[PDB]
Amino acid sequence: HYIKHPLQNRWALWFFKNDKSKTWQANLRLISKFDTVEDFWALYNHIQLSGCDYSLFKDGIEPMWEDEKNKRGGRWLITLNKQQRRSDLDRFWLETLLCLIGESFDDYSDDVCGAVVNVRAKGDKIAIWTTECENREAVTHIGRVYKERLGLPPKIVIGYQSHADTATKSKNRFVV
Numbered sequence: 001h002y003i004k005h006p007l008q009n010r011w012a013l014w015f016f017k018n019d020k021s022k023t024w025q026a027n028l029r030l031i032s033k034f035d036t037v038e039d040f041w042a043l044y045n046h047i048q049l050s051g052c053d054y055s056l057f058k059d060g061i062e063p064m065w066e067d068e069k070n071k072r073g074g075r076w077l078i079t080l081n082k083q084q085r086r087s088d089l090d091r092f093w094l095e096t097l098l099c100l101i102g103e104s105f106d107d108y109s110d111d112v113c114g115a116v117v118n119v120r121a122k123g124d125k126i127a128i129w130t131t132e133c134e135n136r137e138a139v140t141h142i143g144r145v146y147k148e149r150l151g152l153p154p155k156i157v158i159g160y161q162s163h164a165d166t167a168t169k170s171k172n173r174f175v176v
């Protein structure tokens, strides 16, 4: 009936089905792809009415450190307490998906790879993944706009961790 409204990029929704008897990548599942506003909303409305983690990454980028577009990058991390799953999780996740498909970081949105939400009994987490941890100007601009877009209290920092550092964990490259 109507002409669909194209998004700037094509996106893929992935999920991680926690299965301890399998190696990490064997639990990744690519659910579906979309490149219009109407197809995004249909998928979002469908998931809402249905550690089982999810991610939205640009087409061609797998949601893993191993991917060529992620190996030299990192993520802005938002940590929620147990009480924030009910009051803030869904709002923070939708606002993060909108930053992605709407290219809310202007030219710096070209550095965005995707976003990951970790559903944990001990506390949920949401991250925006970027392609180059050494791109200080792009990384910091994305972080400041993301923190503001989510209405986070200014005094508390959010940290940007390089995937190389997260993978050899035993520390924040930038804070905003």
Ligand SMILES: Nc1nc2c(c(=O)[nH]1)n(Cc1cc3cc(Cl)ccc3[nH]1)c[n+]2C/C=C\CP(=O)(O)O
Pocket: 014, 015, 016, 024, 025, 053, 054, 055, 063, 064, 065, 066, 116, 117, 118
């Ligand atoms: N090899 C490897 N291991 C990883 C990775 C990774 O990219 N590669 N990741 C990052 C990652 C990508 C991703 C995608 C989805 Cl859909 C859901 C959750 C996700 N987590 C987290 N491990 C370790 C697992 C748990 C630690 P923790 O308790 O901190 O998640």
